Design a protein around this motif. Sequence first.
Motif, PDB file in Angstrom:
ATOM      1  N   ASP A   1       0.854  -1.130   0.027  1.00 39.05           N
ATOM      2  CA  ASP A   1       0.032  -0.050  -0.078  1.00 39.05           C
ATOM      3  C   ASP A   1       0.812   1.343   0.063  1.00 39.05           C
ATOM      4  O   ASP A   1       0.568   2.370  -0.586  1.00 39.05           O
ATOM      5  N   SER A   2       1.941   1.256   0.759  1.00 40.50           N
ATOM      6  CA  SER A   2       3.068   2.331   0.824  1.00 40.50           C
ATOM      7  C   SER A   2       3.441   2.644  -0.577  1.00 40.50           C
ATOM      8  O   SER A   2       3.698   4.102  -0.968  1.00 40.50           O
ATOM      9  N   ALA A   3       3.587   1.886  -1.709  1.00 38.18           N
ATOM     10  CA  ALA A   3       4.297   1.921  -2.736  1.00 38.18           C
ATOM     11  C   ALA A   3       3.271   2.341  -3.900  1.00 38.18           C
ATOM     12  O   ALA A   3       3.623   2.983  -4.841  1.00 38.18           O
ATOM     13  N   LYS A   4       1.933   2.007  -3.633  1.00 34.00           N
ATOM     14  CA  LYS A   4       0.944   2.065  -4.822  1.00 34.00           C
ATOM     15  C   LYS A   4       0.724   3.503  -5.142  1.00 34.00           C
ATOM     16  O   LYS A   4       0.533   4.493  -4.483  1.00 34.00           O
ATOM     17  N   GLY A   5       0.973   3.843  -6.700  1.00 32.98           N
ATOM     18  CA  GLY A   5       0.977   5.166  -7.100  1.00 32.98           C
ATOM     19  C   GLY A   5       1.796   6.202  -7.042  1.00 32.98           C
ATOM     20  O   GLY A   5       1.851   7.217  -7.311  1.00 32.98           O
ATOM     21  N   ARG A   6       3.114   5.493  -6.425  1.00 36.01           N
ATOM     22  CA  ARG A   6       4.287   6.301  -6.431  1.00 36.01           C
ATOM     23  C   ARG A   6       5.485   5.406  -6.934  1.00 36.01           C
ATOM     24  O   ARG A   6       6.462   6.016  -7.501  1.00 36.01           O
ATOM     25  N   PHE A   7       5.654   4.271  -6.464  1.00 39.43           N
ATOM     26  CA  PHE A   7       6.865   3.369  -6.822  1.00 39.43           C
ATOM     27  C   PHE A   7       6.415   2.461  -8.116  1.00 39.43           C
ATOM     28  O   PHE A   7       5.313   2.061  -8.224  1.00 39.43           O
ATOM     29  N   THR A   8       7.736   2.173  -9.047  1.00 40.87           N
ATOM     30  CA  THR A   8       7.483   1.200 -10.108  1.00 40.87           C
ATOM     31  C   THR A   8       8.361   0.356  -9.968  1.00 40.87           C
ATOM     32  O   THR A   8       9.627   0.461 -10.062  1.00 40.87           O
ATOM     33  N   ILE A   9       8.216  -0.969  -9.944  1.00 41.09           N
ATOM     34  CA  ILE A   9       9.030  -2.143  -9.939  1.00 41.09           C
ATOM     35  C   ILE A   9       9.137  -2.533 -11.530  1.00 41.09           C
ATOM     36  O   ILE A   9       8.239  -2.504 -11.928  1.00 41.09           O
ATOM     37  N   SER A  10      10.330  -2.668 -12.056  1.00 41.84           N
ATOM     38  CA  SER A  10      10.789  -3.360 -13.247  1.00 41.84           C
ATOM     39  C   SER A  10      12.105  -4.190 -13.371  1.00 41.84           C
ATOM     40  O   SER A  10      12.669  -4.306 -12.336  1.00 41.84           O
ATOM     41  N   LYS A  11      12.143  -5.080 -14.131  1.00 42.24           N
ATOM     42  CA  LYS A  11      13.213  -5.902 -14.086  1.00 42.24           C
ATOM     43  C   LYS A  11      13.997  -6.111 -15.635  1.00 42.24           C
ATOM     44  O   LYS A  11      13.073  -5.981 -16.491  1.00 42.24           O
ATOM     45  N   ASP A  12      14.992  -6.460 -15.927  1.00 42.11           N
ATOM     46  CA  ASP A  12      15.577  -6.688 -17.208  1.00 42.11           C
ATOM     47  C   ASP A  12      16.197  -7.983 -17.007  1.00 42.11           C
ATOM     48  O   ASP A  12      17.112  -8.233 -16.279  1.00 42.11           O
ATOM     49  N   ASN A  13      15.494  -8.971 -17.722  1.00 43.31           N
ATOM     50  CA  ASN A  13      15.962 -10.458 -17.462  1.00 43.31           C
ATOM     51  C   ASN A  13      17.148 -10.777 -18.089  1.00 43.31           C
ATOM     52  O   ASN A  13      17.887 -11.659 -17.866  1.00 43.31           O
ATOM     53  N   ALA A  14      17.600  -9.981 -19.197  1.00 39.84           N
ATOM     54  CA  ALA A  14      18.949 -10.126 -19.693  1.00 39.84           C
ATOM     55  C   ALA A  14      20.149  -9.871 -18.837  1.00 39.84           C
ATOM     56  O   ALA A  14      21.118 -10.383 -18.983  1.00 39.84           O
ATOM     57  N   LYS A  15      19.911  -8.971 -18.115  1.00 34.27           N
ATOM     58  CA  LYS A  15      21.076  -8.564 -17.001  1.00 34.27           C
ATOM     59  C   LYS A  15      20.762  -9.197 -15.699  1.00 34.27           C
ATOM     60  O   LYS A  15      21.437  -8.927 -14.536  1.00 34.27           O
ATOM     61  N   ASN A  16      19.494  -9.875 -15.556  1.00 35.47           N
ATOM     62  CA  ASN A  16      19.037 -10.182 -14.058  1.00 35.47           C
ATOM     63  C   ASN A  16      19.049  -9.070 -13.075  1.00 35.47           C
ATOM     64  O   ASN A  16      19.771  -9.130 -11.957  1.00 35.47           O
ATOM     65  N   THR A  17      18.500  -7.908 -13.477  1.00 35.42           N
ATOM     66  CA  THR A  17      18.603  -6.736 -12.529  1.00 35.42           C
ATOM     67  C   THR A  17      16.998  -6.465 -12.283  1.00 35.42           C
ATOM     68  O   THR A  17      16.305  -6.795 -13.317  1.00 35.42           O
ATOM     69  N   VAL A  18      16.790  -5.997 -10.940  1.00 35.88           N
ATOM     70  CA  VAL A  18      15.410  -5.258 -10.755  1.00 35.88           C
ATOM     71  C   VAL A  18      15.803  -3.898 -10.332  1.00 35.88           C
ATOM     72  O   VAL A  18      16.747  -3.455  -9.722  1.00 35.88           O
ATOM     73  N   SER A  19      14.522  -3.104 -10.538  1.00 35.72           N
ATOM     74  CA  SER A  19      14.817  -1.746 -10.357  1.00 35.72           C
ATOM     75  C   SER A  19      13.488  -1.186  -9.594  1.00 35.72           C
ATOM     76  O   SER A  19      12.439  -1.552  -9.819  1.00 35.72           O
ATOM     77  N   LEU A  20      13.677  -0.421  -8.764  1.00 38.22           N
ATOM     78  CA  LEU A  20      12.526   0.223  -8.030  1.00 38.22           C
ATOM     79  C   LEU A  20      12.689   1.686  -8.378  1.00 38.22           C
ATOM     80  O   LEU A  20      13.522   2.471  -7.795  1.00 38.22           O
ATOM     81  N   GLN A  21      11.681   2.517  -9.212  1.00 35.53           N
ATOM     82  CA  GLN A  21      11.610   3.761  -9.432  1.00 35.53           C
ATOM     83  C   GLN A  21      10.699   4.258  -8.211  1.00 35.53           C
ATOM     84  O   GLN A  21       9.649   3.944  -8.050  1.00 35.53           O
ATOM     85  N   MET A  22      11.326   5.222  -7.476  1.00 35.92           N
ATOM     86  CA  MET A  22      10.630   6.120  -6.469  1.00 35.92           C
ATOM     87  C   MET A  22      10.329   7.234  -6.690  1.00 35.92           C
ATOM     88  O   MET A  22      11.167   8.250  -6.602  1.00 35.92           O
ATOM     89  N   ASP A  23       8.931   7.783  -6.903  1.00 32.28           N
ATOM     90  CA  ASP A  23       8.742   8.913  -7.290  1.00 32.28           C
ATOM     91  C   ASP A  23       7.982   9.740  -5.876  1.00 32.28           C
ATOM     92  O   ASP A  23       7.512   9.028  -5.109  1.00 32.28           O
ATOM     93  N   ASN A  24       8.179  11.144  -5.629  1.00 32.70           N
ATOM     94  CA  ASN A  24       7.643  11.927  -4.730  1.00 32.70           C
ATOM     95  C   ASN A  24       7.691  11.232  -3.245  1.00 32.70           C
ATOM     96  O   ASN A  24       6.800  11.021  -2.594  1.00 32.70           O
ATOM     97  N   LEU A  25       9.144  11.150  -2.994  1.00 32.28           N
ATOM     98  CA  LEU A  25       9.420  10.922  -1.534  1.00 32.28           C
ATOM     99  C   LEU A  25       8.949  11.522  -0.489  1.00 32.28           C
ATOM    100  O   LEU A  25       8.951  12.933  -0.566  1.00 32.28           O
ATOM    101  N   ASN A  26       8.737  11.015   0.648  1.00 32.54           N
ATOM    102  CA  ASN A  26       8.447  11.930   1.729  1.00 32.54           C
ATOM    103  C   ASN A  26       9.346  11.148   2.911  1.00 32.54           C
ATOM    104  O   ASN A  26       9.847  10.226   2.834  1.00 32.54           O
ATOM    105  N   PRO A  27       9.388  12.050   4.238  1.00 27.77           N
ATOM    106  CA  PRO A  27      10.458  11.453   5.196  1.00 27.77           C
ATOM    107  C   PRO A  27      10.117   9.992   5.688  1.00 27.77           C
ATOM    108  O   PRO A  27      10.889   9.428   6.023  1.00 27.77           O
ATOM    109  N   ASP A  28       8.988   9.644   5.682  1.00 26.88           N
ATOM    110  CA  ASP A  28       8.441   8.352   6.137  1.00 26.88           C
ATOM    111  C   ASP A  28       8.859   7.347   5.131  1.00 26.88           C
ATOM    112  O   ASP A  28       8.697   6.214   5.634  1.00 26.88           O
ATOM    113  N   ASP A  29       9.347   7.575   4.021  1.00 29.55           N
ATOM    114  CA  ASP A  29       9.836   6.587   3.213  1.00 29.55           C
ATOM    115  C   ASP A  29      11.380   6.279   3.645  1.00 29.55           C
ATOM    116  O   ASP A  29      11.971   5.268   2.985  1.00 29.55           O
ATOM    117  N   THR A  30      11.999   7.042   4.578  1.00 30.63           N
ATOM    118  CA  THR A  30      13.327   6.764   4.838  1.00 30.63           C
ATOM    119  C   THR A  30      13.508   5.410   5.434  1.00 30.63           C
ATOM    120  O   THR A  30      12.777   4.838   6.291  1.00 30.63           O
TER     121      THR A  30
END
Length: 129
Positions: free
Chosen positions: A61-90
């Motif tokens: 719930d904390s991440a919905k509508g702000r964070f985006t998870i994606s992955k690159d299977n060729a490199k086996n990497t995963v990423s988290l895009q974190m938009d509009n951060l606030n201090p409670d995300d620390t």
Amino acid sequence: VQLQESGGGLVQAGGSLRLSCAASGRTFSSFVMGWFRQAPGKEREFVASISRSGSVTRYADSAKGRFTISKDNAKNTVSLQMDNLNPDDTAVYYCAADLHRPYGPGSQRTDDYDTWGQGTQVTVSSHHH
């Protein structure tokens, strides 16, 4: 299989960061990967997960509508895009892999993940001054 996070650090309130996590070592295929976070004195909690294929995702719930998870299977990497951060995300953010799970997105339970990264510290300062 080992995991290593990067991309954390200190960021202004309302800023954005992209965390990434890269696998290394002998790999068999792609796998379910997920993100968790933990603040001092608090339990480690689910943030987001994604299927082995990359097709299906889940978010806390904390991440919905702000964070985006994606992955690159060729490199086996995963990423988290974190938009509009606030201090409670620390928190320290950890990536994790579930090497067993052939179908569906990653579980929200920490116990289901075989492999853990060492975490990357994310600090969101408030906007003041």
